Structure 1
Amino acid sequence: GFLPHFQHFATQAIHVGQDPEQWTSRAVVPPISLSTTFKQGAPGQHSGFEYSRSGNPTRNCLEKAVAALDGAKYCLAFASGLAATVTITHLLKAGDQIICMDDVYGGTNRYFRQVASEFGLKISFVDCSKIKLLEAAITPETKLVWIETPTNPTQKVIDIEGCAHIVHKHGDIILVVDNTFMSPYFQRPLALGADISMYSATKYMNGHSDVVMGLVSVNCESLHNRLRFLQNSLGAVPSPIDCYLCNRGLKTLHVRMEKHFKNGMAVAQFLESNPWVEKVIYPGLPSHPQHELVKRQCTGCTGMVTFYIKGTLQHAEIFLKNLKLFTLAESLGGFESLAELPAIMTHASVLKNDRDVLGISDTLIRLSVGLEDEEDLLEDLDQALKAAHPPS
């Protein structure tokens, strides 16, 4: 009942940007070019690479590949997801307004609220999961709308096409979708009318818990030109070696994400039928309030499962303490299963009062279900919940 899978995604993940004819060696895998600079035939040269920060072989290959995966004309790679966000925010100018989804990655909240806001930029956090609130929030000064769907960590789901229609109805406003949770395998914001599909590649895109990186895919020519200028001019660029590592991780994205889905659904179903679990938030469950919308705008679901443990903070901590396969740690989207308590870990950067309004309570637990054997994951959760045994 989900959107059919995107045609040629695996083939393109494996081949786009990776053409052996690019290289004098005819290497089937692109070389890692670390060189900072490149020999020119003559000064002032509308041709070839000039300086690594501006462009380089290995990054350019990754970017072509990711663009294809997004269904985009262009992609730009960055030192981090947060650096991608900063770079996108520099598309604006003093006097402009930014609307940000109310529930986002704690670092996104922090950057807008505490940093961007000091540079002539007005920041409004709006629950864009209610389309009419986004509509009522847009002002003549609105230039950027920043959404996550599903949101990190409460996994509210936003109608991308509906928001796109609203945002584009009047004025000249950029709609960004931070697609970190879904990956382009399961969701294509550009197809749904977003102007930018952004990633923390640190999570699923790379998927190997060993690269910090951001990615920004785009179709519109002037917007690309503006972004490319800032990639070079702000210089928040990724190592070519990280570009290689990410591009390598991309070649298994399809097979990893299918297994994140299988395992994530299994975990989500298990927790929902568990008497020590108050509530489960998983887009793949009929219980999710936007489950049908998910099926309309996605081809599947990820390994991110949010739930509320019964009881108190104590029970949440005893549960986490008793995990023997899941690891207590920040981040998500890697091969290993992770568990965290956002209110005190990843979203400690979000003001407590906002946490409270958003439902990021002492008992909200976020899981990043990895690629381990399903039976081992379920047994780990089962024993850890029994160790906590909150009132049922």
Structure 2
Amino acid sequence: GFLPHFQHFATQAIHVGQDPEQWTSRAVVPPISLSTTFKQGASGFIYSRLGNPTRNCLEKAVAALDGAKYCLAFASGMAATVTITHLLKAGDQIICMDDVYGGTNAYFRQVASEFGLKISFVDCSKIKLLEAAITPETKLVWIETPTNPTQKVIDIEGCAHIVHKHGDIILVVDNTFMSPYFQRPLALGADISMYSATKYMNGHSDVVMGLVSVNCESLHNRLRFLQNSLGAVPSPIDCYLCNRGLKTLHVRMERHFKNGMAVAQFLESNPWVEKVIYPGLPSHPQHELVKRQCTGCGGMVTFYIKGTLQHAEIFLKNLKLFTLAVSLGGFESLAELPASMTHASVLKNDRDVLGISDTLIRLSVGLEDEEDLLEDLDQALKAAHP
């Protein structure tokens, strides 16, 4: 019994921001407005970076999908993370989940720390290791559930409760892995629902984009100021392409759910898999939390292969359908070894504590036929452990 699916999601995803009354042509699809400037002083558009129709339409839609009042689009998820951090000042403290996306973790420790920001990496899954790390100078808590790539799950409503009792602290949930179709962090008390739209949101492996949804007025005004002032904004063509991808987010995420579950169950009953981590599986440590907190699950399946890296690498090389590549969340199935690839930027003593061993494989389960996905995992595991 997961959370019941969010009402009107498919309808809002297809229609919010797409009202044909906005355009003199009454086009059913909003036009791509490339114009950098607009004629004045003879609607309310001045300069593309400060706001432009195609981006605004996508922002109105993504907000609705999050159940938020406002949304801001960015040139990437990374740029969305950097813009949020600019909400602070020198002397403030940032608490970050210990297992996050490599670049998020790389940004905080190598860049944000150089500008008077203190950053502490804390296992926020564990209840009051978090409150032990909170001080009166904490201003931002950055959690990511499920985590990348070990997919630890955080009680958002509980973690929000811990966070909001210490004055003004912004809780951010990086919702990249689940999409708002499966999880609505703002409904669970978080202050900011943030996405790398590069993944599931656009869903078509052809747009680098970030998204930031928010309810609080002042938080929005400050974020909105920073969107114009820092200029890390997306192309209107990319905004159009992402809005296009959104129109199928509901049917894609449900197919990701069905294929991901099938893959996860196959891996768990397989004689050559040590362990499977999938929030939809009962064997997941927080599976009951997931069902209370989500309406389903994406196609991110993480597992440990038996043996050493020699077997992990023969497995990847023998895949004929999964593509050995970085990134996730598209229609095509991707496989990757985080020790060498996506989390190679995190140093190894932090790899051993989070669990990113050399046998940890991350799968992005795509929209191909479940038959073909299992058979290629079958054949490729038999070649690795023959």
Deviations 1:77-132 (A, max 9, x none): 00000000000000000000000000000010000011101010000000001121
Deviations 1:223-242 (A, max 9, x none): 00000000000000000000
Check if 1:232 corresponds to 2:223.
no
Deviations 1:39-69 (A, max 9, x none): 0016xxxx61000000000000000000000
Deviations 1:123-145 (A, max 9, x none): 00000011211111100110000
SS at match of 1:306: strand
Deviations 1:243-285 (A, max 9, x none): 0000000000000000000000000000000010000000000
2:244 to 242, 248, 258: 248
Unpaired segments ≥5 residues, structure 2: none
Measure, in 1, the Cα distance between the counterparts of 2:265 and 2:296: 15
For residue 171 of structure 1, report the CA deviation from its aligned partner.
1.3
Deviations 1:168-206 (A, max 9, x none): 012100000000000000000000000000000000000
Deviations 1:265-317 (A, max 9, x none): 00000000001000000000000000000000000000000000000000000
Check if 1:345 corresponds to 2:309.
no
Measure, in 1, the Cα distance between the counterparts of 2:222 and 2:351: 34
Measure, in 2, the Cα distance between the counterparts of 1:135 and 1:375: 47
Check if 1:53 corresponds to 2:77.
no
For residue 351 of structure 1, report the CA deviation from its aligned partner.
1.3
SS at match of 1:183: coil
For residue 343 of structure 1, report the CA deviation from its aligned partner.
1.1
For residue 364 of structure 1, report the CA deviation from its aligned partner.
0.2
SS at match of 1:192: coil
For residue 348 of structure 1, report the CA deviation from its aligned partner.
0.7
Taking the TM superposition and a 5 Å limit, the aligned residue runs for 1:1-392 are: 1-41=1-41, 48-389=44-385
Normalising by structure 2, report the TM-score: 0.99
For residue 356 of structure 1, report the CA deviation from its aligned partner.
1.1
For residue 370 of structure 1, report the CA deviation from its aligned partner.
0.3
Measure, in 1, the Cα distance between the counterparts of 2:67 and 2:91: 33
For residue 337 of structure 1, report the CA deviation from its aligned partner.
0.1
SS at match of 1:212: coil
Measure, in 2, the Cα distance between the counterparts of 1:381 and 1:233: 48
Unpaired segments ≥5 residues, structure 1: none
Measure, in 1, the Cα distance between the counterparts of 2:2 and 2:133: 31
SS at match of 2:153: coil
SS at match of 1:191: coil
For residue 352 of structure 1, report the CA deviation from its aligned partner.
1.3
SS at match of 1:169: coil
CA RMSD of aligned residues (A): 0.6
Measure, in 1, the Cα distance between the counterparts of 2:158 and 2:339: 30
Measure, in 1, the Cα distance between the counterparts of 2:287 and 2:250: 22
Measure, in 2, the Cα distance between the counterparts of 1:342 and 1:236: 28
